[PDB]
Paper text:
In coronaviruses (CoVs), nonstructural protein 16 ([name]) and its non-catalytic stimulator [name] assemble on the 5′-end of nascent [name] to perform the last step of RNA cap modification—S-adenosyl-l-methionine (SAM)-dependent methylation of the 2′-OH on the first transcribed nucleotide base (N1), usually an adenine. This converts the status of RNA from Cap-0 (me7GpppA) to Cap-1 (me7GpppAm). Here we report two structures of the [name]/[name] heterodimer complex in the presence of a cognate RNA product (Cap-1) that consists of N1 and an adjoining N2 base (me7GpppAmU), and a byproduct of the methylation, S-adenosyl-l-homocysteine (SAH), resolved to 2.3 and 2.5 Å, respectively.
The surface area buried (BSA) at the [name]/[name] interface is significantly smaller (843 Å2) in the product complex than the substrate structure (930 Å2). The byproduct SAH in both structures binds similarly in a cavity at the C-terminal side of the parallel β-strands, except for different orientations of their carboxy tails.
Residue numbers in the entry:
A (entry chain A): 1 to 298
B (entry chain B): 18 to 131
Write the structure that this text describes.
């Protein structure tokens, strides 16, 4: 009813609890479009509605944060999503970005190549990704789980994310993976979110809140993608740009959260309760250093 | 003793009637801000628009050296304000005007000292 005055729509809890089989996707809209304000690009409006929904959850925010961003270049030679992320975060925060082809940018430091040649020495408080390949969509053969750049992402999280941190990662009907749905059961809460300015497509963002380092429930990833296609096929959504006109409350609030270092045998039920409500981070606090690998035969 | 001078090949290309540079990046904001020229967050008023800094610099966009014993860019990593009746060529506006070192406004379009 009043859905057209929000920034978007999230998946309800009773659809997550069923046992369905997989089918083809077919939407009632498709070839409709929204009306944008004078002179504004489509990817500036999409990143503004995602940051307005994250302001309603329980994230941790310390003195001297650290953030990293994959898939950030474009076919024009510049970077629009990196300029919206630096307007939202507090002054003093450090930020790094990357892609497979060359481009120009506003971040503190930048690297060029395939994602499997990248290495770092320290740990991070938040991670964002928009990578995609268009040769995946074909309606003439069967629809199976995919590998490629999804195999690198599952390993980076288990080795270099701090206890207490968060993530957000993009998918579609034919671009998806079954162990990534199984790792959402190692956080305290999870969902899937759709923006009101691109609602005639099958795109969404997969989100995890406050990390614990071991399993809390068990999930089968082939059955949970088929429950997500059933929801979209029986509930249609109306297109809108109302929320881009009121910006008086946009910036993220400074909480001052505390930081400690601890060894694997000191974690008791008092500690585990503090991580679940957004009030503690665990890692070391030294300097930051990075690099990239090069092959010689020329 | 030879070196190239590209600030003046653009000025002569426009005077014969060429098309200005495109795809500079514009932002959403309240339009009740301060009015000054270069800042750490957006500050436009009722007569202005605001843009991201790297996409409006001539040396960054052509892939060449910055004119300074120690290459230093004045714009990368910040935000810049432009008057609404000149917003079809933002690269040309910044190459021609100068800032006041006392109040922070553009000379000709805001400063009221002398
Ligand atoms: N293996 C890989 N390594 C790195 N980048 C990759 C990749 N596979 C795909 N990509 C990149 O994923 C990107 C998808 S389009 C990105 C649009 C951009 N975020 C904007 O703000 O407008 C492309 O630029 C593509 O080069
Ligand atoms: Zn420059
Ligand atoms: Zn003055």
């Amino acid at each position: 009813s009043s859905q057209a005055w929000q920034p978007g729509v999230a998946m309800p809890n009773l659809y997550k609890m069923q046992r369905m089989l997989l089918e083809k996707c077919d939407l009632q809209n498709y070839g409709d479009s929204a009306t944008l304000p004078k002179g504004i690009m489509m990817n500036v409006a999409k990143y503004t509605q995602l940051c307005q929904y994250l302001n309603t959850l329980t994230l941790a925010v310390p003195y001297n944060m650290r953030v990293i961003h994959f898939g950030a270049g474009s076919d024009k030679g510049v970077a629009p999503g990196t300029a919206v992320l630096r307007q939202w975060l507090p002054t003093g925060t450090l930020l790094v970005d990357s892609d497979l082809n060359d481009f120009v940018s506003d971040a503190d430091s930048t690297l060029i190549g395939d994602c499997a040649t990248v290495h770092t020495a320290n740990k991070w408080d938040l991670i964002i990704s928009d990578m995609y390949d268009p040769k995946t969509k074909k309606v003439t053969k069967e629809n199976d789980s995919k590998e490629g750049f999804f195999t690198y992402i599952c390993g980076f999280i288990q080795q270099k994310l701090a206890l207490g941190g968060s993530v957000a990662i993009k998918i579609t009907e034919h671009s998806w993976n079954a162990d990534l749905y199984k790792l959402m059961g190692h956080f305290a809460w999870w969902t899937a979110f759709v923006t009101n300015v691109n609602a005639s497509s099958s795109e969404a963002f997969l989100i995890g809140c406050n990390y614990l380092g071991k399993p809390r429930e068990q999930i089968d990833g082939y059955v949970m993608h088929a429950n997500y296609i059933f929801w979209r096929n029986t509930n249609p959504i109306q297109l809108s740009s109302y929320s881009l006109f009121d910006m008086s409350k946009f910036p993220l609030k400074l909480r001052g959260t505390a930081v400690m270092s601890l060894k694997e045998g000191q974690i008791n039920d008092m500690i585990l309760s503090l991580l679940s409500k957004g009030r503690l981070i665990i890692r070391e606090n030294n300097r930051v250093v990075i690099s990239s690998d090069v092959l010689v035969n020329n | 003793a030879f070196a190239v001078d590209a600030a003046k090949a653009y000025k002569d290309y426009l005077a014969s009637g060429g098309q200005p540079i495109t795809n500079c990046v514009k932002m959403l904001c309240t339009h009740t801000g301060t009015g000054q020229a270069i800042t750490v967050t957006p500050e436009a008023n009722m007569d202005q628009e605001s843009f991201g800094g790297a996409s409006c610099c001539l040396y960054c966009r052509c892939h060449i050296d910055h004119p300074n014993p120690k290459g230093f860019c004045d714009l990368k990593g910040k935000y810049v304000q432009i008057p609404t009746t000149c917003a079809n060529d933002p690269v040309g506006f910044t190459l021609k005007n100068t800032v006041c070192t006392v109040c922070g406004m553009w000379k000709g379009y805001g400063c009221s000292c002398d």
